Design a protein around this ligand. Structure first.
Ligand SMILES: Cc1cc2nc3c(=O)[nH]c(=O)nc-3n(C[C@H](O)[C@H](O)[C@H](O)COP(=O)(O)OP(=O)(O)OC[C@H]3O[C@@H](n4cnc5c(N)ncnc54)[C@H](O)[C@@H]3O)c2cc1C
Ligand SMILES: CCCCCCCCCCCCCCCCCC(=O)O[C@@H](COC(=O)CCCCCCCCCCCCCCC)COP(=O)(O)OCCN
Ligand SMILES: COC1=C(OC)C(=O)C(CC=C(C)C)=C(C)C1=O
Ligand code: SF4
Ligand code: F3S
Ligand code: FES
Ligand code: FES
Lengths: 239, 264, 601
């Protein structure tokens, strides 16, 4: 069933923008990113996209496909009817560079504020020993392709620009949990997760976990356990 | 404006671009919560039709029944406090703790932060709030004491288990009458909900680092995590089963046959 | 316009590039990291196998000698033996130091790194985590970089005091002073503004060339950059005719157009691949994964003379075979991925498989111990490098190659910079020339050419005439139409401005793609024998003498797409005592001329 679909792609830059109506041919089994590529090669050569692999597994093609934060290379495009209009816009949490590309640099600025992995300062590279059950929890969080859809959808920073400097976001609190559950790490980070990275800003409404293409249980496996550990350290009258 | 209408963000003058019914789940949450709260308040303050003398059936909404104004035989832990004046419920010992336990529940916080406080109403729909502090300030910072209400809920679950065990009565000793079935199912499901708690997961083995040197707590944590994956469902299920247990016991106390299996 | 001064510039952040950056910082250097994509999003993330390293965690009979012999076998003894030996004996160290950076592999019962078995390896060697090993490697390297700049912040007061990352930046030229590297010139994707780096050393590590082919598993960034950069700077390329093709990859459904299908699927019902006939002409084995050259020749013939698919492939139906539930158990990941991504039911409908370009074993001719470069202070590592895998790569060897030779490249750059009397200076004329060249596609250019149309024509021509099976006439026709295509490239017109304009970016990449395609076609025409990934139909006799010959490519002259000359040099005397004895005379007599005379006792 090859048909002509109605796209409503957003065009513009940081000075203003608008949705534009395009008609593209859709074949069976194609993702949204294929339709965008066809539109680029046929109608809009200068349309801003930022894809790299087109197979999942990276995070380059993050957009909001029909109001929902998705990966363009993973959206089946048969999710939508043949008479349904598909509206592709950039991420609405980060500053817009051009049509579908945003300035995702708040994330890379947050990445270098979290203390890194610290091993014991006697262990040699070939002498590390870890059991599988000791590494499963952190291995789950290491599945994260840095798409930043979680960061985009979070309402703490999506709906409040003043909270950007106080809140690290779901991805980096998950990173803190991953480093905290590492069996060989030495740094605590529990106090700083609450005091400088704003774990308290997080109410656990869980809309992040729901956008993760990797199906990481962000709220249940990372955020709530870290809140419980912070409560151990700070909010437990048994002292 | 403030969130997606900020100067540097892409110029979309629509609150959301979603085309589904994103408001459907908050409505269902609101009606369910309102129905349970209304029924529970009315039945807890009714003050009658809560005890079957023949088969020793006691509603969980009246379970710790420590007043001398209570029906004969309903006080399983003694009678402690006088007579209550029309606005103290007969189960004032446990109802505040259970209400606080479910109010500080991690799942319930999600539910009403979405539904009542509209923190996100839906996932990518912009807030009706201009400022947001989360759980950092004085009222909402108190949600971090949930583990103590979890301990209280463990104690209250033990009390309800005692009630269910003593419910196996007949005017000739042992008895089994479908009120036992309803009560026992409710108690079991309440135990499941209490043991699937996020604070239980942390306390059992969630706060450990090396699961390899703690074999017992690793097994406990694995089973508790399997239960915790379904924590959303058990909350609603236990609300329903509490309502039906109350309704059946009330019907039998007022008047209806119990459908006994060991007649008395 | 925007100028930066550094000691070394690493053009690319993958395994090789990030390892080189870490090593250069350790030796003490100001390092600039230039990436065409976002930080941590290189093609390395797509690898799902493991790292081949003789750690001996699973069984202790492994050694670097066994791994060296396995690598030399898988490559048909065309390998650079020094590079193979050095990778074999340095691979476990790099994997071990990966987990000092925070990497979490799968574990054994003793608490060591788990190793899996793979095709060409004698012993289990591949350190893995799930099937996301490339993601783990690149995440670990990126987080190690972030840790190093946190240390720089604490000690010197600046995150970028020693290491700065320039993501979304594309390098278009290398600047020379007197034949030596003087810096790199490029543009920012976001703004289109020009940036000049002024380092005396450059490490390339730019990846592969897979975007020149219609069907490929490679990323948007695999446009042959690095190969063309070194080739225009004055270095040389080797083994450009050796490209890995998987005979069975999905072609039609665009959502899955380069995903490789393993022969395990053919370990069941095979390719019906016609309208009304199973056409492999069929315990006497079913034609299940005959030497994949034979499968590929059958597929090519049936595409030409036979019932081919509308998309130019074959079918490979497993539906009319073992039951639906048996499929969903034997093929867990493939079934789920295909159903959720292409709406293709493996248990109900046939596939659309065909030949797909995967890996290029050629690249910049390097010094084995240090990194690349003939005249300049130029260095190279990774897929853009050439020599390690002669005719064919072992699975798992590329990921460990990245670490081993990225470290070697960083250390060689540091040695070169420390051994330097004075620093070469960038000339303004070269910068003006580069600016003019990159701004040329914006002029009207009567008889305009669309970059996308030219790219598609190049991809079709390379897929058709330079494939798994090469013929002399088809390669000659490919060269003849490459000349026409590069003549048409002089008229390419780009519409729009400079603010993140992907048509302009494609127009810039097309010159590198054309140069690399010419090199590949000429090498494939010149090598008249079959070995590994290079198959000649008119020379089917695998393994002529033809083994101590590298067939090196170089630039002759004539802009803006220069022509190439391919020459035939001899390799270094094969192996000094790497004539083990497990390397028997019986095995070596199938690959070597009677030139040993120094092997048996
Ligand atoms: C789908 C797939 C699966 C694979 N699976 C496996 C496997 O299981 N096992 C295995 O051993 N190997 C595998 N490989 C091969 C292996 O992944 C590659 O050989 C390896 O990733 C090459 O890494 P690299 O660091 O050289 O380059 P990459 O990390 O791929 O990228 C090079 C970097 O250079 C940058 N760059 C390029 N051009 C420019 C320019 N002009 N300016 C600035 N920057 C530039 C790019 O942006 C990129 O950051 C696979 C390859 C593919 C495509
Ligand atoms: C099954 C039975 C249980 C079902 C119960 C469901 C019904 C729940 C409905 C009631 C809860 C809805 C309120 C949730 C939001 C509370 C309002 C709030 O957020 O407080 C704001 C301020 O408003 C208030 O002062 C709140 C006053 C009323 C709240 C009192 C109880 C509500 C929740 C308490 C949880 C219990 C924790 C204490 C432990 C006993 C601060 O938020 P801010 O982002 O705007 O930050 C601005 C800082 N100035
Ligand atoms: C935001 O300021 C406050 C705290 O942090 C300093 C608290 O710990 C507490 C105590 C709360 C707990 C859960 C111990 C309160 C009430 C408070 O208002
Ligand atoms: S966590 Fe899931 S969603 Fe957030 S970035 Fe990593 S992958 Fe994308
Ligand atoms: S949606 Fe964002 S606000 Fe918290 S619960 Fe998930 S990280
Ligand atoms: S393009 Fe790499 S994630 Fe979709
Ligand atoms: S977290 Fe829900 S009952 Fe404890």
């Amino acid at each position: 069933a090859t048909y002509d679909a109605k796209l409503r792609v957003w065009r513009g830059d940081d000075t203003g923008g608008e949705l534009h109506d395009y008609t593209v041919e859709v074949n069976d089994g194609e993702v949204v990113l294929d339709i965008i590529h066809r539109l680029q090669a046929t109608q809009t050569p200068d349309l801003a996209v930022r894809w790299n692999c087109k197979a999942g597994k990276c995070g380059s093609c993050s957009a909001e496909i029909n109001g929902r934060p998705r990966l363009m290379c993973m959206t089946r495009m048969s999710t939508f009817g043949e008479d349904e209009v598909v509206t592709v816009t950039p991420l609405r949490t980060f500053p817009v560079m051009r049509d579908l590309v945003t300035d995702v640099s708040f994330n890379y600025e947050k990445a270098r504020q979290i203390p890194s992995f610290t091993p014991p300062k006697d262990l040699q590279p070939g002498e590390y020993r870890m059991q599988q059950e000791d590494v499963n929890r952190s291995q789950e969080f290491r599945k994260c392709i840095e798409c930043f859809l979680c960061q985009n959808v979070c309402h703490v920073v999506r709906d409040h620009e003043e909270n950007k400097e106080n809140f690290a976001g779901p991805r980096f609190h998950m990173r803190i949990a991953e480093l905290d559950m590492h069996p060989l790490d030495t740094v605590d980070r529990k106090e700083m997760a609450q005091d400088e990275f704003g774990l308290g800003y997080c109410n656990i409404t869980k809309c992040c976990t729901e956008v993760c293409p990797e199906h990481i249980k962000i709220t249940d496996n990372a955020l709530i356990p870290m809140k419980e550990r912070v409560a151990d350290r700070k909010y437990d009258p048994i002292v | 404006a403030t969130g997606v209408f900020s100067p540097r963000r892409a110029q979309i003058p629509e609150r959301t671009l979603r085309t589904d019914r994103w408001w459907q789940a908050p409505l269902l949450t609101n009606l369910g919560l309102a129905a349970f709260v209304i029924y529970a308040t009315i039945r807890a303050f009714w003050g009658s039709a809560y005890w079957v003398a023949d088969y020793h059936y006691l509603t969980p909404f009246y379970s710790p029944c420590v007043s001398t104004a209570c029906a004969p035989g309903s006080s399983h832990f003694g009678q402690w406090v006088g007579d209550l004046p029309w606005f103290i419920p007969m189960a004032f010992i446990s109802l505040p703790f259970l209400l606080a336990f479910r109010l500080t529940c991690y799942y319930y916080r999600k539910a009403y932060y979405r539904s009542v406080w509209q923190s996100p109403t839906a996932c990518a729909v912009a807030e009706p709030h201009a400022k947001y502090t989360g759980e950092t300030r004085f009222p909402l910072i108190l949600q971090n004491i949930h583990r103590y209400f979890f301990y209280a809920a463990v104690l209250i679950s033990l009390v309800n288990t005692y009630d269910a065990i003593t419910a196996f009565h007949s005017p000739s000793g042992f008895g089994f009458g479908l009120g036992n079935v309803i009560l026992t199912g409710n108690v079991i499901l309440l135990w499941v909900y209490t043991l699937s708690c996020h604070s239980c997961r942390h306390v059992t083995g969630g706060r450990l680092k090396h699961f390899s040197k703690h074999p017992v707590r690793y097994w406990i944590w694995t089973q508790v995590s399997k239960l915790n994956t379904r924590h959303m469902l058990f909350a609603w299920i236990t609300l329903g089963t509490l309502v039906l247990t109350d309704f059946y016991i009330m019907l039998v106390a007022s008047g209806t046959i119990s459908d006994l299996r060991f007649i008395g | 316009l925007e100028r930066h001064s550094y000691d070394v510039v690493v053009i690319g952040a993958g395994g090789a590039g990030l390892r080189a950056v870490i090593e250069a910082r350790e030796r003490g250097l100001r390092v600039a990291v230039v990436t065409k994509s976002l930080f941590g999003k290189a093609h390395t993330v797509m690898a799902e196998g493991g790292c081949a390293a003789a750690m001996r965690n699973v069984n202790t009979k492994d050694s670097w000698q066994v791994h060296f012999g396995d690598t030399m076998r898988g490559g048909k003894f065309l390998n650079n033996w020094r590079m193979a030996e050095l990778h074999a004996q340095e691979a476990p160290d790099r994997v071990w130091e990966l987990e000092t950076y925070g990497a979490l592999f799968d574990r054994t019962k003793d608490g060591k790194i788990s190793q899996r078995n793979f095709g060409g390896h004698t012993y289990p060697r591949l350190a893995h985590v799930g099937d996301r090993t490339g993601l783990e490697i690149i995440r670990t390297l990126q987080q190690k970089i972030v840790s190093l700049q946190q240390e720089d912040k604490r000690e010197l007061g600046d995150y970028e005091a020693r290491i700065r990352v320039f993501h979304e930046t594309s390098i278009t030229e290398l600047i020379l002073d007197d034949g030596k590297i003087a810096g790199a010139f490029g543009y920012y994707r976001e703004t289109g503004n020009f940036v000049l780096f002024e380092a005396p050393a450059v490490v390339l590590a730019t990846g592969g060339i897979g975007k020149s082919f219609k069907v490929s598993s490679n990323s948007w960034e695999y446009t042959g950059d690095g190969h063309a950069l070194a080739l225009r700077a004055g270095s040389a390329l080797i083994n450009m005719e050796f490209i890995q093709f998987h005979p069975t990859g999905m072609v039609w459904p665009l959502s899955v157009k380069g995903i490789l299908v393993t022969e395990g699927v053919r370990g069941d019902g095979g390719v019906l691949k016609n309208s009304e006939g199973k056409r492999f002409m069929f315990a006497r084995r079913t034609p299940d994964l005959l030497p994949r050259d034979e499968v590929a020749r059958a597929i090519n013939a049936e595409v030409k003379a036979g019932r081919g698919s509308p998309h130019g492939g074959v079918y490979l139906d497993i539906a009319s075979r073992m039951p639906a539930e048996e499929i969903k158990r034997r093929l867990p990941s493939m079934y789920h991925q295909f159903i959720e991504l292409a709406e293709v039911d493996i248990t109900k409908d046939a596939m659309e498989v065909g030949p797909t370009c995967h890996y290029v074993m050629g690249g910049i001719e390097v010094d084995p111990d240090t990194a690349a470069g003939a005249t300049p202070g130029l260095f190279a590592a990774g897929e853009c490098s050439g020599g390690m895998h002669g005719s064919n790569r072992l699975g798992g060897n590329s990921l460990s190659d990245l670490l081993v030779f990225g470290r070697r490249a960083g250390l060689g750059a540091a040695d070169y910079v420390r051994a330097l009397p004075d620093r070469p200076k960038v000339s303004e004329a070269a910068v003006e020339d580069a600016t003019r060249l990159v701004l040329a596609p914006f002029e009207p250019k009567a008889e305009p050419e669309n970059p996308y149309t030219l790219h598609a024509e190049l991809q079709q021509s390379m897929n058709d005439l330079v494939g798994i099976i090469r013929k002399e006439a088809e390669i000659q026709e490919a060269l003849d139409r490459l000349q026409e295509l590069k003549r048409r490239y002089a008229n390419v017109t780009v519409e729009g401005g400079r603010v993140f304009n992907p048509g302009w970016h494609l127009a810039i990449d097309m010159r590198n793609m054309l140069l690399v395609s010419e090199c590949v076609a000429k090498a494939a025409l010149q090598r008249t024998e079959s070995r590994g990934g290079h198959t000649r139909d008119d020379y089917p006799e695998m393994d002529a003498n033809w083994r101590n010959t590298l067939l090196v490519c170089r630039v002759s002259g004539g802009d803006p797409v220069v022509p190439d000359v391919t020459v035939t040099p001899e390799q270094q005397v094969p192996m000094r005592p790497d004539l083990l004895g497990c390397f028997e005379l019986s095995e070596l007599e199938k690959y070597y001329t009677p030139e040993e005379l120094a092997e048996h006792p």
